[PDB]
Amino acid sequence: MNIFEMLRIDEGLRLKIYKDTEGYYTIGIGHLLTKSPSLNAAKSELDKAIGRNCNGVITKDEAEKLFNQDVDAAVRGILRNAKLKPVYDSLDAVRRCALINMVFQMGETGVAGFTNSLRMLQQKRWDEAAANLAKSRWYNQTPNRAKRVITTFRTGTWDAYKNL
Numbered sequence: 001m002n003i004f005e006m007l008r009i010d011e012g013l014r015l016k017i018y019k020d021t022e023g024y025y026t027i028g029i030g031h032l033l034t035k036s037p038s039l040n041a042a043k044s045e046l047d048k049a050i051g052r053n054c055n056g057v058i059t060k061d062e063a064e065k066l067f068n069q070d071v072d073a074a075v076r077g078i079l080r081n082a083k084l085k086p087v088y089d090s091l092d093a094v095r096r097c098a099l100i101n102m103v104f105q106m107g108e109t110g111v112a113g114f115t116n117s118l119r120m121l122q123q124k125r126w127d128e129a130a131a132n133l134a135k136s137r138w139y140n141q142t143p144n145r146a147k148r149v150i151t152t153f154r155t156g157t158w159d160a161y162k163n164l
Contacts (some may be wrong), residue, residue: 001095001158001162003071003097003100004067005161006097006101006127006158006161007029007030007067007071007101007104008029008067009030009161009164010030010101010105010145010148011030012030013028013029013060013063014026014027014028014031014058015024015027015058015059015060015063016056016057017033017035017042017043017046017056019101020032021141021142022133023140025041025045026037026066027046027056027058027066028058028062028063028066028067029063029064029066029070030070030104030105031063031066031067031070032050032060032065033045033046033049037061038095039097040055042056043055043056046058049066049144050062050066055091066096069103071100071104074100074104074128075100076094077103078099078100078103078108081108081112083112083115083118083158084099084103084108084111084112084118086122087099087121088121090122090124091121092156094152094156094157094158095121095152095153095156097152098149098150098152098153099111099121101149101152102138102149105138106147113135114133115131116132117132117133120132121153126153126154126155127154129153129154130150130151130153130154133146133153134146134150143151147160148160148161151163
């Protein structure tokens with residue numbers, strides 16, 4: 001298992017514009033298009049992102065390309081973030097994947113807001129951190145995904161995903 005297969009499980013793949021769990025216009029593998037209510041604003045963002053008139057639909061290849069960019073930008077964002085970088089550097093390879101997943105879903109800024117949990121992860125207090133991460137809107141809104149990520153941080157294995 002790797003970051004790509006992990007995120008593909010969590011986000012799914014959709015070739016037509018869709019609304020995400022928060023109601024935002026998205027396409028592909030969790031690629032947010034716009035927080036705007038206009039399908040039109042979404043179609044425009046899409047065409048801008050792919051470089052062709054897509055008419056709200058993309059190919060598998062196009063989705064994978066967006067996905068590659070997004071994973072890349074997620075990692076680079078963690079590496080540039082003063083709060084995130086140290087945590088990331090302190091973690092093992094599996095746990096690094098769990099942090100990248102949060103960043104991909106909720107953005108750098110959102111994750112950087114989890115001050116206490118970040119401190120616990122840095123300290124390698126697995127159980128305490130899993131419990132603290134669960135006290136968030138994130139866990140309440142997308143509990144199955146949050147549980148998978150949380151288990152990954154707690155155990156440092158891919159057990160939560162070997163099921164799936």
